[model samples]
Target: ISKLIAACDQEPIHIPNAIQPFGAMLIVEKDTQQIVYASANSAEYFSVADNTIHELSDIKQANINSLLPEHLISGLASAIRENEPIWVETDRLSFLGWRHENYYIIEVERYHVQTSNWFEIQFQRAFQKLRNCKTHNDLINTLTRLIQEISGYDRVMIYQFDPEWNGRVIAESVRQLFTSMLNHHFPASDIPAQARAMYSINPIRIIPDVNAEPQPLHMIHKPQNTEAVNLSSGVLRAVSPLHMQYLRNFGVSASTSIGIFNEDELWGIVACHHTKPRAIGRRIRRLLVRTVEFAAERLWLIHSRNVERYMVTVQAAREQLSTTADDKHSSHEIVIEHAADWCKLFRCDGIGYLRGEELTTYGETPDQTTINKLVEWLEENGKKSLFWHSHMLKEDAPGLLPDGSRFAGLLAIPLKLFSYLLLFRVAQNEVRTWAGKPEKLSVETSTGTMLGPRKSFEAWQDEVSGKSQPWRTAQLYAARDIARDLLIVADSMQLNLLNDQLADANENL
Candidate 1:
């Protein structure tokens, strides 16, 4: 296997200036199919062009073989076998190939440089960053920054899709020329259900030179093995022209992005945007796609660690709250203090605990109407309630609250304790649109993180979107766990107090 796929040693062939006088060149092993040497010109093509750079023998194993067309692969293979040069062309790519001793050399040039580089850089960086990232934020920040840097784009963001496929900008890296789109949200209607489903098939999707002709994939005359079927170059396998028009609506002339995966699930995207028209090279696209995958892994690990730490903190806080609740203090005081701590623990902008008409809040308070409506909902809707709206007061009943308030979004969690029913209002005070959606929390896992939509979508639209911030999940879970422990402590304290009351009664008798 080593000899069949072994690294080849071949001296760099200095060609005369007339024959392909381009200063750069790349060499690959013919037998085992490894990159043996790359010339100085290689730097112009890739981030690192050192001579020691090796070809990927296991390219197929890396799931990158589908990225290239058949003609180029055939031409390179033929050149190596026959010891000659071969030129190959596809709708989007052109490549020159030749053979030198036991090695094959191929030079590829794509039509659009900006789009080409965007794809390449995005692919490579996705893999590179994912491999090195230690946290979810690190993965997101690195992804956004690298995309902006590589494409010279004004802004780059990771837009995550919810269960219903709504998009939101959870992370962003903005250029000086562009406005910051931090914490902005968008609606699921932006990327409809059908389009999002298509993205699941391919890791990288590119809209190069947005106005380019739409080439339909050629139907396969004879199907190969079901698992070995190729859809990338077939006219049938191309992107929808409608989506190209949609992008143009946002002033994007060219775009390249790769899906971030959490296991087999489509977590989000490393979405790149080019202000002007652009084209991406095949090599760079492959690199960026791979890089994003690597980054995803790091993000997963980081999210895990952050959630663990947050849970630990929440548990500690819950214990303290429970101890304080047990003291012989007024229910109003206990409610106020405990409610404030709960609000802080859950990271809500403000929390309102409603027992009958009385309410207490910390942080920027909601409007009186909104508070009143919440009380009404709790009374009418039983002990279970959920709402995602800016203002709850204007709604008729059990629906979206009116939109005229400063609150962009709100979450109401109703807790029933003994004779009292507590309604907790979780409001978002930031003056940005919510990506119009709500995330569902599952009780199955004691730990796990949820990713939200890409931040770029927020700039395009204003709607409340729900994405999973794994750290937030951890905190919420931790709070729940702590609340449970506190309840246990309170129960024990209540029993002790009951015993004392009994003793007092006996002495009085």
Candidate 2:
């Protein structure tokens, strides 16, 4: 079923006729600045029929340049040459034009000259407040509210993606009438891999009215020397039909998704929803996109600091372990006595040390017999790497896990060739509420085309068992740092003992 839906999602959506009726679009040849493709509604803007506009090189940029105010004409030519979007104004219309592939794409919408003042006031306030944010939660909270206020949407959520591409709504602002999805996790399958890939290239996508009629392109084409018009970068790019149904299933009539990028990666999305049909004007959408870009950049700064802090903690742990290595006591006993430090350093509930055929337990652990069995099982079939970590224990090694949830996770950092320092985490019972029952997503139809988004918006809660909270990326790196240093220390200690034995034997000889 997932493969079938994935096939449907891979269909080309860059060129769709059902562009929300709020604006007009044109695809023009870049070399000659002539028009190639035009939206159905372009007749209203250019007074030329859509079919007539398809005659590439028939109407050039000079013809359209006359429509713009005199001041914008100079900047317009360079904007085309540089392949950037430029704004122009007429008494009644505002224009946004950019070059893509071998053509120049221009979008026109009605202008409100007075809108800039209103945008400036709110934009300044939001940016200032966001800069003041000191933590990840603070940044997301400010952004959700700022976007909702700007868009006037019923719900605005800052949904973040994990390494596995699963999404969770970390921050959300919803009208009192709407239910909050503040911490609900969505399956990675919900947003297919192909769909997530589209976000970075096209940072802003708007579905003005999910239920509104989509206007089809008047003419399709493949010229003699050129390829089919690539509309991937266009503002009026049509969204997937299956996605439209997905939104409808959730009772959303209109939606907008602004991609948030941290460096080159698509970090997440600022998703907005409205109950009734809504079409945000181009000027406002432009403002919101800029606002989100700033927010994404600031968020990157916050998380980078978090990474540094984790590295500092790892350094301190290394110092503690190194000093303990120099102690006269046995390595197993040293680790056992520093149980609190081990738990605090790894941020786990318990620690276990096993070396020289001796097993030492600290904090919370299974019986020593179970520990021996686990160690033997790991040595044979488990990972041979210096560090092995998993949030799920029972599933990975069925026979070796403790019976209860108290030892659900495993993070192993070996001390020597046969010795190890292990950390354990308790199971976390998670309940997830989806927008509607997931079974509704697979609508059984004779066409085998669409699985309907459930008609019901009724919430469905799922009991997620048998796993502890996942390890953080920073935590994994920190554990590896400890593993690398511990190996060096253990090898040195082993080598010194070998030297001492050689000396004693030589002295006897």
Candidate 3:
């Protein structure tokens, strides 16, 4: 069954050997600058005089310099050597060129005029709005709305990936006729692993029409010694058949996606959909791409500021504990003194510290017996973990939490042998609405079992039980910081006499 789901990730999307009908593409060898492969639609798009010509192989001996202007060809070497793509516009056509492995991929599309002053004015307004956003939600909502207005798509949505690779539509701007997918969760299998990897590489994908036929890339002669040209960087690369079926099932005719990255990793996507066929000009696409880049950077800056604020609070708490320590206080006294502050730092309902045979607890918590068993289970099973946490304790570890227990979350930081600092959170019983059933069903086809996208897009409600608020990354780091300080202090006090004896023994030896 896992193998069947893997089929989605195994699809070779980067070397589709085809191009979308909206644009034509050419693959030229880097060494000789000779045309090796061309899309079937290229001859018709270029208006080749020969009416009887059937395939691009008809001009097998063609060189790139013969087809394109010398000015465009002159800088080809320099343009493809860089990481960023370069764009050139002629009187009628627009050319987008990028490097992929040992070949140069060139995409040709119909040109649309762009006024410098108009773009500058519109972008300034959009940039001001983006800068004014004070929260994460506001930033993404503004992004979706701005992209919807600029692209004129029927709907624009922000789909953010979770830890499990599932996606949730966090923000949306849809027309009156379309249904909203805001806050709707989708399965991880919706977009496979390889598909997600490509988002980091290309960052943008546009399908003008789902029903449009794809034009195959025709090669004059097979290069037996070489690998096929990678189409990952090209704008006109064909869509995967499985994904085409996915769009058709969703009733989307035209679609576009812009990747939102957190540095090198893909964090989310800006998805656009239309009911009818539509085309976006090259300049508009470039503008949308840049807008996402700037928005991503702004989001990163906001997150960094938040982390800094959290660290400052954590540092103050740790320093207070260190400054108040004394020879009269044992580990249990330390735990009792700072229990309230620890609860506040971790944002938990209650906290407990476990030592051999003795347990100290504060605030709302489970019974003594339950706490001891939880610690015993962790020592027996989770020995290697420096810290462990779960939001849904009943589901994640059923027997650990007894029936009718109020606590549903736990964050444990290991201190010493069989001792830990445990934080507990009460159950929230959250309600979630999914775009569908949150599962991709496998359909039996002539080629055996194949994973299929769900047919429905209506909101489906579900109740999540025995779950508490999730722990943030900052909270986890704070726990680790406190644990490290405690261990250092504990070791210094316990081994102070041992250190003198060891020093004397070493000197004598």
Instruction: Report how far off residue 495 is in candidate 3 (Å).
Output: 16
**Candidate 2 C-alpha lDDT tens digits along 203-303:** 87888888776655544233334445656655676667777887987778899889898888888989999998788877678878999998988888998
Please tell me which model should have the higher lDDT, number 1 or number 2.
2
Q: On residues 389-437, what C-alpha lDDT tens digit does candidate 1 reach at each position?
A: 2233233242534554444334444333321222233333334556333
Q: List the residue pairs that clash in candidate 3.
A: none
Clashing pairs in 2: 17-215, 17-216, 18-214, 18-215, 443-451
Question: Which ranges in model 3 have alpha carbons more than 4 Å from their true place?
Answer: 31-33, 48-63, 78-84, 99-102, 220-228, 316-344, 353-362, 375-389, 392-398, 412-421, 438-449, 462-464, 476-509
Alpha-carbon local distance difference test for all models:
0.50, 0.72, 0.80
Clashes of each: 50, 5, 0
Candidate with better TM-score, 1 vs 2: 2
- Candidate 1 lowest-lDDT run of ten: 4-13
